[PDB]
Design an enzyme around this catalytic site. Structure first.
Site, PDB file in Angstrom:
ATOM      1  N   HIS A 155       0.528  -1.061   0.026  1.00  0.00           N
ATOM      2  CA  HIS A 155      -0.109  -0.466   0.028  1.00  0.00           C
ATOM      3  C   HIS A 155       1.059   1.165  -0.314  1.00  0.00           C
ATOM      4  O   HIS A 155       0.176   2.094  -0.585  1.00  0.00           O
ATOM      5  CB  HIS A 155      -0.737  -0.127   0.802  1.00  0.00           C
ATOM      6  CG  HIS A 155      -0.204   0.268   2.055  1.00  0.00           C
ATOM      7  ND1 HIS A 155       0.164  -1.104   3.213  1.00  0.00           N
ATOM      8  CD2 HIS A 155       0.418   1.222   3.709  1.00  0.00           C
ATOM      9  CE1 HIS A 155       0.665  -0.827   4.153  1.00  0.00           C
ATOM     10  NE2 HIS A 155       0.805   0.725   4.851  1.00  0.00           N
ATOM     11  N   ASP A 169      -1.125  -7.479   0.206  1.00  0.00           N
ATOM     12  CA  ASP A 169      -0.297  -6.624   0.623  1.00  0.00           C
ATOM     13  C   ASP A 169       0.556  -7.332   0.725  1.00  0.00           C
ATOM     14  O   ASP A 169       1.433  -7.339   1.535  1.00  0.00           O
ATOM     15  CB  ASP A 169      -1.337  -5.839   1.591  1.00  0.00           C
ATOM     16  CG  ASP A 169      -0.534  -4.361   1.696  1.00  0.00           C
ATOM     17  OD1 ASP A 169       0.611  -4.425   1.663  1.00  0.00           O
ATOM     18  OD2 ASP A 169      -1.017  -4.060   2.065  1.00  0.00           O
ATOM     19  N   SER A 229       3.990  -0.113   9.022  1.00  0.00           N
ATOM     20  CA  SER A 229       3.994  -0.918   7.940  1.00  0.00           C
ATOM     21  C   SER A 229       4.819  -2.351   7.858  1.00  0.00           C
ATOM     22  O   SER A 229       6.281  -2.017   8.455  1.00  0.00           O
ATOM     23  CB  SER A 229       3.822  -0.125   6.713  1.00  0.00           C
ATOM     24  OG  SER A 229       3.113   1.043   6.504  1.00  0.00           O
ATOM     25  N   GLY A 230       4.262  -3.771   7.684  1.00  0.00           N
ATOM     26  CA  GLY A 230       5.032  -4.667   7.880  1.00  0.00           C
ATOM     27  C   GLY A 230       5.124  -4.926   9.142  1.00  0.00           C
ATOM     28  O   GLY A 230       4.809  -5.310   9.871  1.00  0.00           O
TER      29      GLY A 230
END
Lengths: 237, 237, 49
Positions: free
Chosen positions: B41, B90, B186-187
């Site tokens: 994303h 994702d 994120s991640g």
């Protein structure tokens, strides 16, 4: 006179803890407190000296560190009635009536909860208007108690998604810290503050549904055409 | 990371942060010294031109240089069946132009093989550079937290997500709250303890806030996408 | 002589069997049901138990 009391009553079992039985003859005491109540047939084993049952945690707890005598006796079923009254105040405050059950049936609680003075199973209808998914009913809560804690939040694309507290039910909830209703265990000589109330069926004045009250069960007390009653005698001094 | 503590300089050499425009944006983990696994994303169309990207590894406090001493991203490969509405699939890969030889505090993590037989309530660890309590800034120091894995059936409840979790994603965290990742994580390495070796089986895609009740964390299941990563690595060389 | 106690039922029943002046010898419920009694020590003697 203990002999006359045992003779005029259909005694089934009489024992004592931290005190002898026949030593009362000729002995003097200061005060004697008696607590009598019916015995359910299903939960009869929860009245022993030490048991992690629901009766000793939500209905009546027997102290072990005190000299207390136990008497299981029987009463004929002729000319007898059972008074099923809920000693909770905040439950009847919002319109709680009676269980409306059959005769020769006693009610016992399995989960007792405790709430504070600032508690109202009711949401502010001004905030519930902006809700689309899982919209609970709302009404006007009386002054002195805050409304139900509900927050509007979006996950990925749902703008009107309102999440409240005490979900799904206060008995088995996913976050007990966010729900004001907390599990409590009754003590020595203390009643239960109240039972669990489903906030999804509550709400003019905030009137919860009578079928939304959970945390209790009913059971008959007929055994050999007689009812069994337990009595605890505590002698102070 | 909410409710955690500062991560001591131990042995966690699977956290590489991708920086663009000299500011921290997202992070990820590495499996081989030729690729970097991160979210998809943050690689949208406005985030094109991978030449203006650097990678920082083995750096706890994000202050050691200024527009230098980094690894330039050569090419970025995203999942072809990516949907921006439901945020599915994702997973993205970024290939570096540097060999990135192994040294002290530099060791990748192996991919999970099919048939791990994971426990339902499995314990895992999360880490990243995000907020502190709510809507904060980028954490200067590296922190970590401990979470538990929950089943997909309970996560698809009507009071949690109302069946909005794809089979390619899993849910983890605590239902009571106070332990969740905020915006910016994120991640993030989501590894577990099994057979004395860590396995990366998580990839943060989205979420509904942090430290909130009935709002668990959603992670990506890289086990289903392992064949895609193998095919991409085979076609690259 | 053996300890004299009385029983109620048998053959896999409740069997509420009762004994004499049990359990506490000092603070008992019936001191006239078991031979062990308290006697004041005289002059020039010891305590027999």
């Amino acid at each position: 006179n203990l002999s006359t009391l045992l003779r005029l009553v259909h005694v089934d079992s009489f024992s004592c803890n931290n005190l002898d039985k026949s030593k009362i003859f000729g002995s003097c005491f200061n005060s004697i407190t008696v607590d009598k109540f019916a015995i359910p047939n299903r939960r009869r084993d929860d009245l022993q000296l030490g048991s992690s049952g629901f009766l000793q945690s939500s209905n009546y707890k027997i102290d072990i560190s005190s000299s207390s005598c136990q008497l299981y006796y029987s009463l004929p079923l002729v000319n007898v009635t059972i008074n099923n009254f809920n000693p909770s105040s905040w439950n009847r405050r919002y319109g709680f009536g009676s269980f409306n059950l059959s005769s020769y049936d006693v009610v016992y609680s399995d989960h007792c909860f405790s709430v504070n003075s600032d508690f109202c199973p009711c949401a502010d209808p001004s905030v519930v208007n902006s809700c689309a998914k899982s919209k609970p009913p709302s009404a006007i809560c009386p002054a002195g108690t805050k409304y139900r804690h509900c927050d509007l939040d979006t996950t990925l694309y749902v703008k009107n998604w309102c999440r409240c507290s005490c979900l799904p039910d206060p008995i088995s909830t996913y976050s007990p810290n966010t729900c004001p209703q907390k599990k409590v265990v009754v003590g020595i000589g203390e009643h239960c503050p109240g039972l669990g109330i489903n906030e999804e069926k509550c709400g003019s004045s905030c009137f919860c549904s009578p079928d939304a009250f959970l945390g209790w069960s009913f059971d008959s007390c007929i055994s050999n055409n007689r009812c069994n009653i337990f009595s605890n005698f505590i002698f102070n001094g | 990371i909410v409710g955690g503590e500062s991560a001591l300089p131990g042995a966690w050499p699977w956290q590489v942060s991708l920086h663009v425009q000299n500011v921290h944006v997202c992070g990820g983990s590495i499996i081989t010294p030729e690729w970097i696994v991160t979210a998809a994303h943050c690689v949208e169309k406005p985030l094109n031109n991978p030449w203006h990207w650097t990678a920082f590894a083995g750096i706890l406090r994000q202050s050691f240089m200024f527009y230098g001493a980094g690894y330039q991203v050569e090419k970025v490969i995203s999942h072809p069946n990516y949907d921006s509405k439901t945020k599915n699939n994702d997973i993205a890969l970024m290939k570096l132009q540097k060999p990135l030889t192994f040294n002290d505090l530099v060791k990748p993590v192996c991919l999970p093989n099919p048939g791990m037989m994971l426990q339902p309530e499995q314990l895992c660890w999360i880490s990243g550079w995000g907020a502190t309590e709510e809507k904060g800034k980028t954490s200067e120091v590296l922190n970590a937290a401990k979470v538990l894995l929950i089943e997909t059936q309970r996560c698809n409840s009507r009071y949690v997500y109302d069946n909005l979790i794809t089979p390619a994603m899993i849910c983890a965290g605590f239902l009571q709250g106070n332990v969740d990742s905020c915006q910016g994580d994120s991640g993030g390495p989501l590894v577990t303890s099994k057979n004395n070796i860590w396995w990366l089986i998580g990839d943060t895609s989205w979420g509904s806030g942090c430290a909130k009740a009935y709002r668990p964390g959603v992670y990506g299941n890289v086990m289903v996408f392992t064949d895609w990563i193998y095919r991409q690595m085979r076609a690259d060389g």
